Design an enzyme around this catalytic site. Structure first.
Site, PDB file in Angstrom:
ATOM      1  CB  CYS A 108       3.237   0.772  -8.928  1.00 13.70           C
ATOM      2  SG  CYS A 108       2.481   0.685  -7.277  1.00 13.70           S
TER       3      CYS A 108
ATOM      4  CB  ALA B 241       2.712   4.320  -5.039  1.00 17.88           C
TER       5      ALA B 241
ATOM      6  NE  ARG C 194       2.241  11.874  -0.407  1.00 17.27           N
ATOM      7  CZ  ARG C 194       1.132  12.396  -0.925  1.00 17.27           C
ATOM      8  NH1 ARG C 194      -0.051  12.132  -0.409  1.00 17.27           N
ATOM      9  NH2 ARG C 194       1.240  13.167  -1.980  1.00 17.27           N
TER      10      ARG C 194
ATOM     11  CG  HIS D 175       0.225  11.569 -10.043  1.00 16.47           C
ATOM     12  ND1 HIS D 175       1.484  12.018 -10.406  1.00 16.47           N
ATOM     13  CD2 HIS D 175       0.320  11.073  -8.787  1.00 16.47           C
ATOM     14  CE1 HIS D 175       2.312  11.783  -9.398  1.00 16.47           C
ATOM     15  NE2 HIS D 175       1.625  11.243  -8.385  1.00 16.47           N
TER      16      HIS D 175
HETATM   17  S1  CLF Z   1       2.947  -2.746  -8.118  1.00 14.13           S
HETATM   18 FE1  CLF Z   1       1.200  -3.926  -7.742  1.00 14.13          FE
HETATM   19  S2  CLF Z   1      -0.189  -2.665  -6.977  1.00 14.13           S
HETATM   20 FE2  CLF Z   1       1.905  -1.600  -6.874  1.00 14.13          FE
HETATM   21  S3  CLF Z   1       2.474  -2.288  -5.040  1.00 14.13           S
HETATM   22 FE3  CLF Z   1       3.043  -3.877  -6.272  1.00 14.13          FE
HETATM   23  S4  CLF Z   1       1.414  -5.563  -5.895  1.00 14.13           S
HETATM   24 FE4  CLF Z   1       0.837  -3.345  -5.370  1.00 14.13          FE
HETATM   25 FE5  CLF Z   1       3.248  -6.467  -4.696  1.00 14.13          FE
HETATM   26  S5  CLF Z   1       3.303  -5.530  -2.614  1.00 14.13           S
HETATM   27 FE6  CLF Z   1       2.631  -7.742  -2.452  1.00 14.13          FE
HETATM   28  S6  CLF Z   1       3.294  -8.758  -4.477  1.00 14.13           S
HETATM   29 FE7  CLF Z   1       1.251  -7.876  -4.820  1.00 14.13          FE
HETATM   30  S7  CLF Z   1       0.271  -7.599  -2.595  1.00 14.13           S
HETATM   31 FE8  CLF Z   1       1.204  -5.631  -3.524  1.00 14.13          FE
END
Ligand code: CLF
Ligand code: ICS
Ligand code: CLF
Ligand SMILES: [Ca+2]
Ligand SMILES: [Ca+2]
Lengths: 477, 522, 522, 477
Positions: A59, A62, A93, A192
């Site tokens: 996402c 990340a 990472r 990014h």
């Molecule tokens: S797309 Fe969104 S910002 Fe990206 S990683 Fe996912 S939440 Fe995070 Fe999730 S892993 Fe658990 S259910 Fe939320 S706290 Fe976080």
């Protein structure tokens, strides 16, 4: 396999999907034609992932926190929202750095506002302001703070920009609000862009009126090298042996000061085009600093890159360029002499993020290996443009490959080696196919530069030729 | 530079003089680094009682948590069911993280899908994501069941899973009869263990709520076992082994051990083993249901008691001697099976090991952390060994649990110097191990940064980490170990005593200085 | 001095300033000690190639052997028979040592009698000792069998065991049909493993030589398994487990697993389990006999082939992947039972672990020692793992064995830098680990002294010990481990890879120096 | 238990034995009467062990090599004969020393002539001479060599005395032949005697003609402390605090030079009577040096011993004596206050070698424990004379106890704690009786002196009151 055969493999694989998914995924799979220089004639990219198909993509958080901001070593990066995202991305990472962790450097720590229900219902801005004070008390040598928004922040309508501006003013501190919520974009890629724009808006302009930095004609910055297992350091060493002065690394082993000094350089050297072309464009528009793409994977690309970079400077740098190339010549020649006979002819399939799927091809070819399929998680068509010339005729390209597709492609093509991520590794090992992690370098590396090529060659050899692979079949079956 | 017959990776490549000089030059040129004396001054301050007091006053900042979010637990629960795909409704970034977290710990494939909701879904909701996602997943990966949990985007925007799944069936995206149990798994409530409970209660409801009329408690002559969130394969295995040895009819509800340990034989098996749909459907017909980890199975317990009418016994996690004994005796009472001579001997072998190792264990001081049930089991066993569990940390613990642990400590002379901490993190624990130094830490891989910190102050202040819990990312195959039952007690005893002896060897390895105590026999 | 709340044992009591001062005064006043510079000079010389050359020219001096004497092995062999008292004819000082050696390794009771021959027995020999000894043993400890071996005094004096036992029965000291198998076990011939072979062939011969007339090869539909000298409980266990999983009828001849792991349940059991007399008497009726450790079972093999007429298969010890495969395929062939799904899966789990761990193991350099079968199996498995077994030492090895191991090394690219040493000791091994430094040593507790020696030269020269073998005295409960079969391989793999990663964590724990490579995930 | 019960226990136990062994064993078992000062009226000792009855005893070689010679740190001790004896006894005994092992000190090393059949048939003297040269080459800082005969040496008619004299003359090195073959005597005891006679004959007289050492009136030696877990160091510190000068320690952490200086002292302080009374008697005969027995187990005995020793000197030493006693008073008092309430009334049975079965009784009494049974592996009647007054009335004494006897005595007497050796330990733990190793101190100690007492008290408490002893009964049985 012929072009007709690869086309027929793509069609077989797509037979499993419902109509909607089938129609979509057909557009994201192609047989390479190196003549074609407009990839928008052959493949679609940077679209939404089809639901339920086990994409490998992450996402925008990340892409921002994990990738661009996280490595900046002397800032504290807050994973703002609930506890998960900051915990799974904690030290995953290998963006390496020199520092005293918990004291002046904070990369492998996980700072979080750990949202509870009351924060979701009534908002987290008050909590963020209190968090910032607590950070200032317990981590007094931090040189700035970033706020990396997780999914809920934007959804509940918090105002992190306000908090950042008010607290920043109060504490005379750089506090960077980053709207990198994972619901934005379709992948790491938008993260990014967001992260670059945050650097632009809150950090990069800070020394615009400051004339105290002692610049020289040979000042460069390494843009978009995250120093995976030391990759940036084994790049920097060569640039400085060539007589250049590396003012900044963005952002592996990066400091906030070297980001702020970057508008003072003569040339921006872009490794990762995908993640940092945005800020490179901006620096050329605002500061008149030119930028150029380079590649330090393997001797062929590294030599070509050193010579292209040196050609931007004067005769003194071009002369040191040839000195560097002469120095390392025996070293990479010895690597090739040892490992190429062990790897020659072997066929590799790659799947990685936004750069390596094309950037490592040269390095494989320096060991006589063939890249017979490659693809990307989140690349744009400008990446595929750069790919089609680097891959052979009738090789397989895949954009945002599904778990299913990747498995079926491998079953048919039977590569000698696969280079992909951790979510892929254990699947392929079970199938008896040598696998190297091409994100984390399998806890090895660096792979950049001349010193990196030795490790890379060692690594492909130890895995492809390991005795374990002969052993998967019980002698009684 | 590299020499081709002895190639150097990052360690020790970057210790070469040319790299050292280059990195000094980068620091001095461009990093505007705090002077080393100031770094040492601040470091020393972070080791102090004064810093600890400030550290323990934090209300808003969390640093180095020792918990994860609900859907991680939902996924693990789901994986324990036959041919079941874990399916997390909401944001795909989450699923990439869940998969890799578990990938790194089990060194195994971890299959899980998302339905890739984007920003656009904030207008409508993710009903279309669910319809196409269920359809796509079923056609592509051909599971027999899809178990649906949620990411925090889906919880915040307020998607009604139930209605979405029903509408999926109504509009023909998946068959009406295709099993699609679900649970709401908000990351901002509780932790990964809550996710596990929520998901299991969902699956149990799915299979039993509406077909209760024909069920008769005890009619299948089995005992249901619900393991909860469990990342040691040895723990599923030891429970099934002991129950088989006893001749006890049983159903292990959520059993991922096969799918987390497939053979490398030339094919990838996306599904293996696991609890069958038949087992879940028939579970109300059991004599009773035993919960191995009661402190995160409270919702499951309310369902099993309220709907199945099972008289779920008050058992502690079967860890250590006393609690494994209590587990076996309860199982014997419910099943009517006597405890067989095999388990009686195994018990005596663990006691034998206790008598053998007691002198090295006696009075050893530990800091430890983990999930509540694991932590209280570890505390209990440590007291049984004559060790002092002085810093007991459970980030995801609650007040009631803490009272229960406090009672356990109060009931042993070995509990005298022990404090239990809930809601506190590893940056809190770091302070404790500086200000009230224990002998060792027992914890997950995150503890290695605390050991680094302690060594930096000095060798005599270093607190070695003993890796037990989740996740363990920096050692290989520890996820095959056991912590439950007599076998688990043996494994833990062995790890502990040998950690003590390895450390003693290191402190006594100095020729003509400390090696007068470098004994061949310990 | 002591402080009552923190009492100090020898370490660190003697580091207190007053003890340090006292020890300095003792040395200076009365020890006439060599100057430290000269101690350092000599130490540095013992690390050199020049010193190694002198060291390897030794013909008369043995320093820090890696073997024991025959009767130790006879004793262990005898302990594996139901209600059998091991009985060593000759000097009691021996028996005190045999029991203590095994007591320290197994942390268990070890029952063994002597017949307490003194200097007086040089005149006529120990016939009366035997007569009263057998009668006294039988009355007091009530064994069902007494298995007689010899100490070196009885061998030099030339006592005829056979005649002495026969005269004991003739004169009515023990009953005529009370079983008293015997073996001559001269400590000055071969080693402890030879004593095991001698004892076993003695017992075999006792129960079968004179009753061969009614025996038919194959008639009992079992396979005899002879384990040899074996000090891992897990090794007896895993063989029995695999055979049982295959549905193979078998008789394990010498099985001390029960008597070396009795429960601590409030009673001492001098005897438990073990091979029955009925099993030894019926052993010629098996399909065949398999020797798990053929390089110290040569006498047994001649007797089994010559007298029982079993066609003993050419099988290596079942260590590692290939040799466990070959063992199971041979057993399948003889028994006509297929290898079941359970062992096929276990095999693939081992292979999975090998794929998971290969990158850390690859090219890792080992020194190792032990008994011949153990060492060649370890060598084999290391090559399977892509490791380099550079220094292979077997003090009790022979030329034929060395040629066998040299062939194994030749059939692998990973054998290229390996040398096999026979008749050499740990003082020889010490030189090798200085002059041609490996990454690790795989050995018994005696190895710790080589590790201390290497550290003294410098941290970068330290060669850590990995404890696998016999004896292990300075860790607890490692005697419960497994080295054989897929289970053993898994255990060895895990131990090796985690030894590597523990050392890497130590080398990268240095804040702002080497901790750039202190990765959370490996 | 009353005198009548204990006598009845002895008769019931002896019932199992054949008549010859019954008649013998009856003479080595007795009910203590503290009035009796002639133990030869009550028990016989130092006789051959009955064949087949599982004695706990060792041999002469254990008494010479393992006990007396082995600890001398700057000599090389050769286990001469086959490989067994040297290997089993390699570092089993915790005779602690300060040195650089393999360089100037050799205690935990196993040097051996590893006899093969050709050495048995044709003799080992040629091998011994060649071994000595090889020792000299590879261990040049050794200050002397001892040759510790194993069983075969004297059986085959080797002449180690001749090899020692010739090689010793050739190299001008002390090379001590010791005829401690295991077939000699009945136990470890005769090894002591042999070993003492070897010190006398080949070492002790070396400096008879040398007048360079500067004596003081306060010169003592500690005779028969082998420094188990540092016991001699925690004794020596007290003696020097009292103003004495400890010239030598025999033989724990001992050097050949301090043994050679011993004839220069004013007073020999004998801890282990059994093992070192021989040489003590010799030094009084030849050098006029008086000796006295002492005891440093527990505060009562240590105080009594310090006072008795100090009374041999002048008022300045008696004064410092009272200073030492005053210094450690609060320390041992704190130990008693903590541990005596935890141990009071608890009953112990001991079985050890030649000294500690009587010497530790005072230490147990200082924690309110009662020794209800004690015995020795190889003590003589003069040891039992010293025992009968230290033991309570109607307590059980056993000489060269059989395994059988010891188990049956314990089953009836049901002591709270047993203190014996490694061959006993695991038996009694299975019976649920707390066990402490009273040889090796269970890898603990020192137990000597005031600093030792604290450790002893700690250790008796940690074992006797361990939670593991409550758990031997399965709660379903
Ligand atoms: S797309 Fe969104 S910002 Fe990206 S990683 Fe996912 S939440 Fe995070 Fe999730 S892993 Fe658990 S259910 Fe939320 S706290 Fe976080
Ligand atoms: Fe993504 S676009 Fe993603 S060169 Fe860097 S994290 Fe390339 S460390 Mo991981 S390996 Fe350019 C990335 Fe790394 S192909 Fe990969 S997904 S920023
Ligand atoms: S009484 Fe005699 S000296 Fe004492 S210890 Fe026994 S041999 Fe030795 Fe024996 S243990 Fe083996 S059988 Fe010989 S070599 Fe040695
Ligand atoms: Ca795996
Ligand atoms: Ca034991």
């Amino acid at each position: 396999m012929s072009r007709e055969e690869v086309e027929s493999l793509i069609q077989e694989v797509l037979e499993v999907y419902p109509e909607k998914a089938r129609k979509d995924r057909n557009k994201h799979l192609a047989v390479n034609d190196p003549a074609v220089t407009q990839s928008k004639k052959c493949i679609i990219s940077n679209k939404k992932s089809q639901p339920g198909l086990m994409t490998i993509r992450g996402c925008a958080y990340a892409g921002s926190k994990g990738v661009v901001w996280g490595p900046i070593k002397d800032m504290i990066h807050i994973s703002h929202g609930p506890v998960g995202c900051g915990q799974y991305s904690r030290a995953g990472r290998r963006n390496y750095y020199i520092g005293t962790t918990g004291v002046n450097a904070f990369v492998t720590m996980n700072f979080t506002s750990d949202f509870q229900e009351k924060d979701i219902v009534f908002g987290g801005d008050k909590k963020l302001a209190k968090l910032i004070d607590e950070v200032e008390t317990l981590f007094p040598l931090n040189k700035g703070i970033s706020v990396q928004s997780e999914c809920p922040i934007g959804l509940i309508g918090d105002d992190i920009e306000s908090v950042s501006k008010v607290k920043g003013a109060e504490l005379s501190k750089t506090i960077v609000p980053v709207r990198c919520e994972g619901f934005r974009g379709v992948s790491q890629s938008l993260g990014h862009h967001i992260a670059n724009d945050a650097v632009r808006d809150w950090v990069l302009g800070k020394r615009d009126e400051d004339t105290t930095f002692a610049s020289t004609p040979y000042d460069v910055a390494i843009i978009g090298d995250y120093n995976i297992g030391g990759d940036a350091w084994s790049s920097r060493i060569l640039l400085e042996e060539m007589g250049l002065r590396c003012v900044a690394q963005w952002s592996g082993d990066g400091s906030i000061s070297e980001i702020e000094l970057t508008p003072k350089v003569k040339l921006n050297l872009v490794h990762c085009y995908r993640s940092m072309n945005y800020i490179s464009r901006h620096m050329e528009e605002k500061y008149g600093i030119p930028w150029m793409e380079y590649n330090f994977f393997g001797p062929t690309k590294t030599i070509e890159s050193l010579r292209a970079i040196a050609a931007k400077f004067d005769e003194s740098i071009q002369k040191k360029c040839e000195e560097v190339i002469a120095k390392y010549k025996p070293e990479w020649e010895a690597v090739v002499a040892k490992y190429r006979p062990r790897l020659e002819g072997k066929r590799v399939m790659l799947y990685i993020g936004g750069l390596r799927p094309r950037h490592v091809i040269g390095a494989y070819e320096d060991l006589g290996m063939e890249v017979v399929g490659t693809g990307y998680e989140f690349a744009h068509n400008d990446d595929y443009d750069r790919t089609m010339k680097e891959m052979g005729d009738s090789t397989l390209l895949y954009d945002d490959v599904t778990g299913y597709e990747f498995e079926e492609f491998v079953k048919r093509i039977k590569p000698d080696l696969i280079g992909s991520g951790i979510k892929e590794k254990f699947i392929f090992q079970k199938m008896g196919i040598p696998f190297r992690e091409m994100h984390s370098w399998d806890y090895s590396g660096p792979y950049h530069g001349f010193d990196g090529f030795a490790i890379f060659a060692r690594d492909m050899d130890m895995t492809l030729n390991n005795p374990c692979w002969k052993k998967l079949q019980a002698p009684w079956e | 530079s590299q020499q081709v017959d002895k190639i150097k990776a990052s360690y020790p490549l970057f210790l070469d003089q040319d790299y050292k000089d280059m990195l000094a030059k980068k620091r001095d040129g461009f990093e505007e680094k705090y002077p080393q004396d100031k770094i040492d001054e601040v470091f020393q301050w972070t080791t102090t009682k004064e810093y600890q007091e400030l550290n323990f006053q934090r209300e808003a900042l969390t640093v180095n948590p020792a918990k994860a979010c609900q859907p991680l637990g939902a996924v693990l629960c789901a994986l324990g069911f036959e041919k079941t795909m874990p399916y997390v409704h909401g944001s795909q970034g989450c699923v990439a993280y869940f998969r890799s977290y578990f990938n790194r710990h089990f060194r195994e494939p971890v299959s899980c899908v998302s339905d890739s909701m984007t920003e656009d879904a904030a207008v409508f909701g993710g009903q279309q994501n669910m319809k196409d996602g269920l359809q796509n997943c079923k056609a592509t990966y051909k599971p027999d069941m899809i178990a649906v949990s949620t990411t925090c985007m889906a919880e915040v925007i307020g998607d009604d899973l139930n209605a979405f799944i029903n509408n999926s069936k109504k509009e023909g995206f998946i068959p009406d009869e295709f099993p699609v149990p679900f649970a709401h798994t908000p990351s901002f409530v509780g932790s990964h263990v809550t996710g596990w409970d929520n998901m299991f209660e969902g699956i149990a409801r799915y299979f039993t709520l509406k077909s209760m009329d024909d069920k008769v408690v005890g009619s299948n002559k089995k005992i249901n076992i619900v393991p909860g969130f469990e990342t040691y394969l040895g723990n599923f295995r030891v429970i099934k082994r002991m129950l088989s040895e006893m001749g006890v009819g049983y159903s292990l509800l959520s059993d991922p051990e096969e799918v987390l340990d497939t053979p490398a034989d030339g094919q990838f098996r996306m599904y293996a083993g696991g609890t069958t749909q038949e087992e879940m459907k028939d579970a109300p017909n059991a004599l009773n249901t035993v919960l191995l980890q009661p402190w995160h199975l409270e919702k499951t317990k309310k369902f099993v008691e309220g709907t199945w009418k099972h008289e779920v016994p008050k058992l502690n996690i079967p860890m250590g001697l006393d609690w494994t004994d209590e587990f076996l005796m309860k199982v014997s009472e419910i099943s009517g099976q006597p405890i067989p001579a095999s388990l009686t001997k195994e018990r005596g072998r663990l006691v034998d090991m206790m008598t053998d190792s007691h002198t090295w264990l006696h009075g050893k001081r530990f800091a430890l952390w983990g999930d509540p049930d694991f932590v209280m089991g570890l505390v209990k066993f440590l007291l049984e060994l004559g060790c002092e569990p002085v810093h007991i940390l459970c980030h995801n613990g609650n007040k009631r649990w803490k009272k229960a642990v406090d009672a356990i400590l109060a009931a042993s002379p070995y509990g005298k110097n022990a404090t239990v901490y809930i809601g506190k993190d590893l940056w809190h624990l770091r302070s404790l191990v500086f200000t009230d130094k224990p002998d060792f830490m027992i914890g997950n891989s995150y503890g290695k940064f605390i050991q680094r910190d302690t060594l930096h102050k000095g060798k005599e202040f270093e607190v070695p980490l003993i890796r037990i819990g989740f996740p363990i990312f920096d050692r290989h195959h520890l996820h095959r170990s056991t912590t439950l039952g007599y076998e688990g007690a043996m494994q833990i005893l062995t790890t502990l005593v040998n950690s003590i002896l390895e450390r003693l060897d290191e402190e006594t390895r100095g020729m003509q200085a400390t090696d007068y105590n470098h004994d061949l026999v310990r």
